[PDB]
Amino acid sequence: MTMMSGRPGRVPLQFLPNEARSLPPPKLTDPRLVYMGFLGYCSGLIDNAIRRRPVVSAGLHRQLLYVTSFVFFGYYLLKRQDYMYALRDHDMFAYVKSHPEDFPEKDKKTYGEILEEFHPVR
Amino acid sequence: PDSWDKDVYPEPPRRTPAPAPQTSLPNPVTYLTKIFDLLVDRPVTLAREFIEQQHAKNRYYYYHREFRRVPDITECEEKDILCMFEAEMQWRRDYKVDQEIVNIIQERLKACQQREGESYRQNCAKELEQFTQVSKAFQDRYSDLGAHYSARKCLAKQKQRMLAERKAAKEAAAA
């Protein structure tokens, strides 16, 4: 089953709806962005290794392009992921609000009144 | 010495008999004691007093930490994690303090047994009696909790014990 595939008002191939602009963008020092850059650096190192070039210093322009492309894609990927989780939270809260009889607020007893069984260890 | 409280670590008044020699032979223990005092104890006291003069020139203090009383596990709601956390920390501190209380009573018992000599079975009745009560209370409080103990399990154990006591008291009243 597709949980949000057909959410009302969804544009077919948008990848980034306008409402997503209401969310704080990921910081450029995001640890996930740094991991994307690390993935790009590893791709560049492996590129040098397969081509039989000096692994660490063969092509700095090519390694830079690897890092830059990975970071550039990761930024928008993170934006979409954060927006999608925000949508999930928004819908879940709205549905709980609109169905009070399904999520009844329960007055909670204290541990002085609850009777828990005791199982001795011996 | 003023290091420790004499009310929590008591001892009898230390009756020591006066030396009453009967023979005219010299006492080797007295000669050896004089030699020990003149050759061993005096340099030790001199060094100690030098160390104490050096200490008195620098004086600083450390403070025993005081902890506030917080609500216990009985007042906490079922899923209120913060009150449960504070109650559990306070319960753990109280458990440690109770362990050290039992330790103090056990030290009293051991010291009495050593001090009284061959009459310990009679002259240590008070210490044995105090240890029996403290041991019974500690066993009632923390026995059988096992690894992974907590304030919740202690509360459940106490509630089970009070239910047993209430049933036993209701049984007696019907006679």
Ligand SMILES: CCCCCCCCCCCCCCCCC[C@@H](O)O[C@H](CO[C@H](O)CCCCCCCCCCCCCCC)COP(=O)(O)OCC[N+](C)(C)C
């Ligand atoms: C091994 C990791 C996977 C690698 C994947 C390939 C990497 C290259 C990325 C591909 C580029 C194209 C994607 C972005 C271009 C525009 C996207 C847009 O046009 O399409 C949108 C769709 O966007 C894409 O779905 C998002 C693509 C992002 C893919 C990355 C997710 C990987 C999973 C996490 C693993 C970690 C990967 C990290 C990379 C290093 C439209 O959404 P919608 O038409 O309504 O959904 C169609 C399917 N439905 C209806 C059935 C739901």
